[PDB]
């Protein structure tokens, strides 16, 4: 709750909703009786519901906020290349076939001291803490004034299978970068609400 001080750092003002500190806004903090309150918890990004984001499992009254908000391009595809990956032996990842136009993930079979076809792709281990930040397509961006969080981060190594390389989907454990808590305090689900008095 203390993220919301007017002009601050933190999680909510940086990767959920950036409270603009220039206009003639006026902030309201109110309450609501929890007889009939159904928190909608929907994901706002296109390219996570395109790769099989169904929902969160939280409780009846838990609100899913965000930690980091990574942005990808339009041709993104978080599965490896299956027509390359078969000759890999070491560190061989899962893969599938991308949808049309979505360029593949860059995976190498480069050479060890003795082993010749050992797999090494990008985005390791997870894009939260990648070792080479200048090469994973999921670029970490800070959210702006009046924008949504453009997508949860995908761990690039739980997106795929081995036998049936279908259209490239992912798996529910692989979306990372969100947590929650319960809104209910004093038997009343608290709520923030902004106002903007323009013109």
């Amino acid at each position: 709750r203390d993220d919301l001080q007017l002009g601050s750092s933190g999680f909510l003002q940086s990767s959920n909703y950036k409270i603009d500190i220039s206009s003639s806004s006026c902030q309201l903090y109110y309450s609501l009786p929890l007889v009939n309150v159904t928190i909608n918890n929907f994901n706002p990004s296109s390219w996570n519901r395109r790769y099989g984001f169904g929902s969160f499992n939280v409780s009846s009254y838990d609100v899913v906020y965000s930690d980091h908000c990574f942005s990808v391009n339009s041709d993104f595809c978080p599965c490896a290349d299956p027509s390359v990956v078969n000759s890999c032996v070491k560190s061989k990842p899962l893969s599938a076939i991308c949808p049309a136009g979505t360029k593949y993930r860059h995976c190498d079979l480069d050479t060890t001291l003795y082993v010749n076809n050992w797999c090494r792709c990008s985005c390791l281990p997870d894009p939260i803490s990648t070792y080479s930040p200048n090469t994973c397509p999921q670029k970490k961006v800070v959210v702006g004034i009046g924008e949504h969080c453009p997508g949860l981060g995908i761990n690039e190594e739980k997106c795929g299978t081995q036998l049936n390389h279908s259209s490239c989907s992912c798996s529910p454990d692989a979306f990372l970068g969100w947590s929650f808590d319960s809104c209910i305090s004093n038997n009343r689900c608290n709520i923030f609400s902004n106002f903007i008095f323009n013109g």
Binding site: K90, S91, D110, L113, Y114, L124, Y131, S132, N134
Partner: protein, 345 residues
Amino acid sequence: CVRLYGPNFILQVYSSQRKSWHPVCQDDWNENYGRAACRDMGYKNNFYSSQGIVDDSGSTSFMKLNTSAGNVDIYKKLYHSDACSSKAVVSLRCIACGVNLNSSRQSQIVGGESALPGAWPWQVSLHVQNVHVCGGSIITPEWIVTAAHCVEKPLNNPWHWTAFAGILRQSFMFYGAGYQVEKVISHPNYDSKTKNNDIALMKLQKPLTFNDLVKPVCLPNPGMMLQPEQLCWISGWGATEEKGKTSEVLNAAKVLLIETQRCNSRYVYDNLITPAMICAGFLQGNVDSCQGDSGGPLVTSKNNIWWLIGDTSWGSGCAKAYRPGVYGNVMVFTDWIYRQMRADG
């Protein structure tokens, strides 16, 4: 059993009862003990200096002199004492290693300005049949270090190992313009699978000069306490991009130290890096500096003085994602060389 140590060069002394290295207090030491002490660790006809310094090393069992007895050796006259009688201990310099002309903008690994001459005064170049192949770094006028996998089979005899120093460019090292061969020691445990011990000393017959372009680099001391993300300065004429030949001029920009647990983890190098292998570079994308020389050294600058820490070794694809360079670990065996430099004379 005697060795240098740390930044201020204290002689440690091993005793069989105490099982431990111990310092010597400066109670009536002499150059007739001191200038005759550099041949103990492989320095015959050289010496620089000796002074008294304050004790901070960390032993509580000192070494004293048996001057009350008559004419015996140094190595007999050393008993223990709890206090230094003048509170000055061994300070030493076995050779004029160290300084260069502190210049500014030598950065010619890719995207920079050339290595200024005399500011890297240990950089050599080694040749067979007058092609530039491997590098190294000088510690005596008669000894020279390099990576062992240059001197591997079937080129393991000394008479085809022509050193050529001095000139930044690929041309001006001519026949006679550079002293030449002698003994090729090796750490005799190089392998094909590990490249553990990829460091081989070399020797020359004709002592060169400390004039301008040539000066011996400082070999490190036993237990000199690096920093886990220290800056490191490499040098060499190596090809800045792979499937090249050689860069024309001397290139001497900077790199960093990666630790073990990043390199030796699962994604960089899956548990390969031995204790006698040090990682270096930056674990990043295409920001690394390749300049492949296989011996073109790793020189750091602790105690405001240049010291040698790593000589180069193998790697992966030239300066790209996830793949740093892995360096030979030349503080591990700085005494093996000192028992392979003792008995050349």
